[PDB]
């Protein structure tokens, strides 16, 4: 629930500024929050909104955009690869951990809905877990796995007041 206010407070801080340019630390917070909610349209325009002087001075903004670039092309293995490739500051560390976990639920829902049978090697890349781990995870959720083929088979497991409003409108 706390993620609702954090995104709004960073957006407002960018709107009003003492000199029209916001602080470097709040730029990374806004970019990370956009990626957490899968709002890639505003994140992409935020990258162009960052002045080149700020982007060149702070290398953190370049790194956070690398993670977003993977999400933009829907490169699931690259989302986990770039998240752990670099070390982030403490003010955006907890939300970026939530971004990595949020990507994990996105992969789980995508496989459960868009796949009737997915090979284990590709399925492990989607979730971001090692191949052996992904084998043990599915049975805990009831998903069937078959040996000698290494293939996973996922499957998805005031009316009265309103009505009198309709009549009153029609009868005037």
């Amino acid at each position: 629930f706390s993620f609702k206010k954090l995104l709004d407070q960073c957006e407002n801080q960018e709107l009003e500024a003492p000199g029209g340019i916001a602080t470097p630390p709040v730029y990374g917070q806004l970019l990370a929050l956009y990626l957490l909610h899968n709002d890639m349209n505003n994140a992409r325009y935020l990258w162009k909104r960052i002045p080149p002087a700020i982007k060149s001075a702070n290398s953190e903004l370049g790194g956070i955009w690398s993670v977003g670039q993977r999400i933009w092309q829907r490169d699931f293995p690259g989302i986990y690869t770039t998240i752990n490739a670099h070390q982030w500051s403490e003010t955006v560390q907890p939300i970026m951990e939530a971004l990595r976990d949020a990507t994990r639920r996105r992969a789980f829902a995508l496989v459960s809905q868009a796949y009737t049978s997915i090979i284990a090697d590709d399925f492990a890349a989607f979730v971001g877990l090692p191949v052996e781990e992904a084998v043990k995870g599915i049975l805990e959720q009831g998903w069937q796995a078959d040996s000698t083929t290494r293939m996973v088979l996922p499957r998805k497991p005031q009316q009265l007041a309103r009505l009198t409003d309709y009549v009153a409108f029609l009868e005037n």
């Binding site: 505003n42 325009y45 796949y115």
Partner: protein, 405 residues
Amino acid sequence: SALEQFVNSVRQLSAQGQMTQLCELINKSGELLAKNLSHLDTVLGALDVQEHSLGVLAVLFVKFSMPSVPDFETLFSQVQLFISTCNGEHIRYATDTFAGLCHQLTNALVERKQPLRGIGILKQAIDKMQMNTNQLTSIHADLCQLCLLAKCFKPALPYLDVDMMDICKENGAYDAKHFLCYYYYGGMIYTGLKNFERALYFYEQAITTPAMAVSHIMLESYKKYILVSLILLGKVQQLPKYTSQIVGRFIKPLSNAYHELAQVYSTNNPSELRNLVNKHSETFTRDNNMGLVKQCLSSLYKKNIQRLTKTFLTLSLQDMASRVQLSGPQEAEKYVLHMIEDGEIFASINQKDGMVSFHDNPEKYNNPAMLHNIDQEMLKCIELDERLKAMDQEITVNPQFVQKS
């Protein structure tokens, strides 16, 4: 004693309660205010920005009316303070000057490098200018332009999600340029947000504006109307009958690269479409809409895949890639998976047999959630009917009406 007397001359107009003569004084004191140069103490010391909003509006507008201002940092700060502390009710008595002041600020901010600082200024300016949120002012175009040059599309969303009803005349200072710019910049704002349903609506309004002379805004809106209708829909949507004849006789000939692009789009052959894009690359990049045309190429593949659902229950990935010209079963698998994620298609991928099965079962229209959707649309129609009935009741009580009936 004499110094306070000059302020007291303002009090007589307020005491009488007639604000009409105060407005006339503002327009008839332009020469006296122009030859002052000492407005630094007039804005705050001479008059109070809270209740003497009319007086402070005139001096600030005069300051912005002088090209090559010696100082801009103090001028921008005074405008920000005045608009933030505007009375609101009396501002509507000087609508032509309030809008003109916002136009001057917008041009100054746009000119150098900073069309971002005024986004919050124009947000409050609109709120203290329009009679209701369901109304269109000239500051709407400026707010959209500021949100466009700074690529901050979210602050303009609350001012674009409301359907405008009646247009503020601002004492005759409202012209068709402000109407065209709002529905052109606002349409491009929705395009950047991948909202092609409302972007197409906004472009259509600009085209349907009555006109007798060629307008650049109406020309570009026609060009982007074709591209958006080719992305959201599979064809160029037909314009309304009340479109001005100039659009179909001048604007259409000037937009020929986009018309032949639609014709190639109708053949459902991506390789021909890419040939026309390369042939007319200079035309599309000159018009600055590069990327919208590339989205037409990607949407053709989605349109072809969606046609497969109208004929197949199960199609091999290799066979599908040969019909949609994706050149590879791996490419077809990625294209189909993205469509399922976005909800554009109802299908599943089976890697055991390398087949894609289309499950054409959208909804049974039985769940209680469908009931909620029905009453949401019903409430929209009821509110639409209430506005329609109310506005004709304004016609009946019109003295000009019933005299001619």
